Amino acid sequence: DEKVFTKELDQWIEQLNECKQLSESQVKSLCEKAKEILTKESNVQEVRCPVTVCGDVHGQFHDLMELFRIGGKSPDTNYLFMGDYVDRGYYSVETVTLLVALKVRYRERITILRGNHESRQITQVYGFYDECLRKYGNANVWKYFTDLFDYLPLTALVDGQIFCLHGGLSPSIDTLDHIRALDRLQEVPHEGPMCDLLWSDPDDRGGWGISPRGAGYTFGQDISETFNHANGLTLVSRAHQLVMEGYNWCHDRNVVTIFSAPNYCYRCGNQAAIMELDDTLKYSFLQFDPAPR
């Protein structure tokens, strides 16, 4: 049962490594096991150092494979993806299928985060729905994956010092316990705490202000400083904004913007970077350029 299911799971992993998508029944079973394995973990899914943490992906499977080559194979190195891996990627369904297969294979050697792009309306209007209708013909895979994104967690904590998330801070929230008391079993609203969690962004401003993205707010240096002294966090690692060097430090080394999807939309030509935290909590940056095709 479990042993043969694990062996067939490894077969699916090998096929996905060989870039071939699975069957609809396999997708249904994988999503079922993913629901049963993602329900248990809380909103602040604690991940323990050492770890390799990774920014946006956005369905660029070849760059994701190069990132695997950079940072080690999934059985060996712990990984942490921080969202946006379903939208406007060409092998986007293969990418998300690989990610969920890796999660249900190694529940605790990897953990994934939920970005703003992993929701029904955003997927419909930015083409993941189009991709899966082109590939599988029907929308069953689409509704499976969106139901799964209804169950994806919210924020990651590294050793009580690093706060990993996609968007950023919010004036609605003050504390990790409020993050815990939030309920995530709902597709993201256009207003509210989950909304500005997945839609915020940094600035050198000070105070708050409305984002140009139409959802969520934009925080300032002193706001981030106040948050980190309030909850004892030492560094907030977020991944939603595209950068050229691959990473940026903001708010006199309190916010780390990570981007790890090189050559954004195949035209921007940006680099990509990922962090690796070694077990005595020592950080290192790995940078790379997209692989030849």
């Binding site: 139409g214 959802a215 939309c265």
Partner: peptide
């Protein structure tokens, strides 16, 4: 395609 940032 006109925009890379999802301004919406």
């Amino acid at each position: 395609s006109p925009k890379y940032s999802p301004t919406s």
